[PDB]
C-alpha cells in the first residue's frame, strides 16, 4: 500500500489513530 500511496505525490503522508491522540493531547496541553 505504501508504494501506491506515494507513487506520484512527494508531499503525500499518512495519518492514523496515534496522530489524533497526539493532537487532543496537544490541545489539552
Amino acid at each position, epitope marked *: *500500500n505504501e508504494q501506491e500511496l506515494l507513487e506520484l505525490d512527494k508531499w503525500a503522508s*499518512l495519518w492514523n489513530w496515534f496522530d489524533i491522540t497526539n493532537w487532543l493531547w496537544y490541545i*489539552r496541553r
Partner: antibody
Amino acid sequence: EVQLVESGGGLVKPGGSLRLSCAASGFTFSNTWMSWVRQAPGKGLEWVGRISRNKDGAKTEYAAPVRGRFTISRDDSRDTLYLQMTSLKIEDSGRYFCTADLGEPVVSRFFEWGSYYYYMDLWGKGTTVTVSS
Amino acid sequence: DIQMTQSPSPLSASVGDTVTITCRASQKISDYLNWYQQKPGRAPKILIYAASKLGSGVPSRFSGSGYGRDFTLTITGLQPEDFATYYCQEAYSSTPTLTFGQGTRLDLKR
C-alpha cells in the same frame, strides 16, 4: 486478502538465539502498529512487545519477562516485522503470533485526551518455537 | 502491576443459553479493557474493546460492560461456532503491560 504470515520457528537450544519474521498484506504496514503475542502449550495468551510506525520513531516497548533479551524491528520496504530472540530459555517455547494493533483515542472525557484504547485487531496463524537441550 | 482474574476454566452451557464471564481486576482500569476469542485451533480474534465497544465483523450477540474493576462478557444467544476460549486484557498502564486474562473455556453441557 488481509493476513499475517509468521515463519522461522523451530528447534533451538537453551541460551541460543532465533529470529522470527512476519510478512503483511492487505493493509498499509507502514501506518500500522505491530505487536508480538506468544502462547505456551496449554497456557493462555501473553503479550511480548510492540513497535510503532517509522513516522513515530519506531519506539519499541517490551514485556518484562522478555525485556533485555528480545528485539522487535520492522522493514516497511518489504512490509515485514521481525522478532530477534537471544539468550533463549525453556519458558520462551510456545506459539508466537504476530499482530497488527489499533488504537481508539479517548474522546468522551477531556482530562484523558492523549491516552487511547489499545487492542489486537489482526492475528496470524502463528509459528511454534521449541527451546530444549 | 495489574493482574486479571476470570471465571472458572470450564463453564458449562447449552445452545441458546445466556452466559457471563467475570473479569475482576487488581487495580482500577476505568474502561481500558478488551475481549478476545480463539477457537480450539485457530488464531485469536478481537470481539470487544474499550470494555463495551464492539469490533467490526463481530455478531451482536456479544456484549461487554463494566468500569473500574469489575467487567463482564455476555453472549445472549449461544451458537455452536462460538464454542471457544475467551480472554480479557488490560490496556490501562501508561507503561504498557497488556496482561491477558487466564482464559475461560466453554464446556458443552451434559
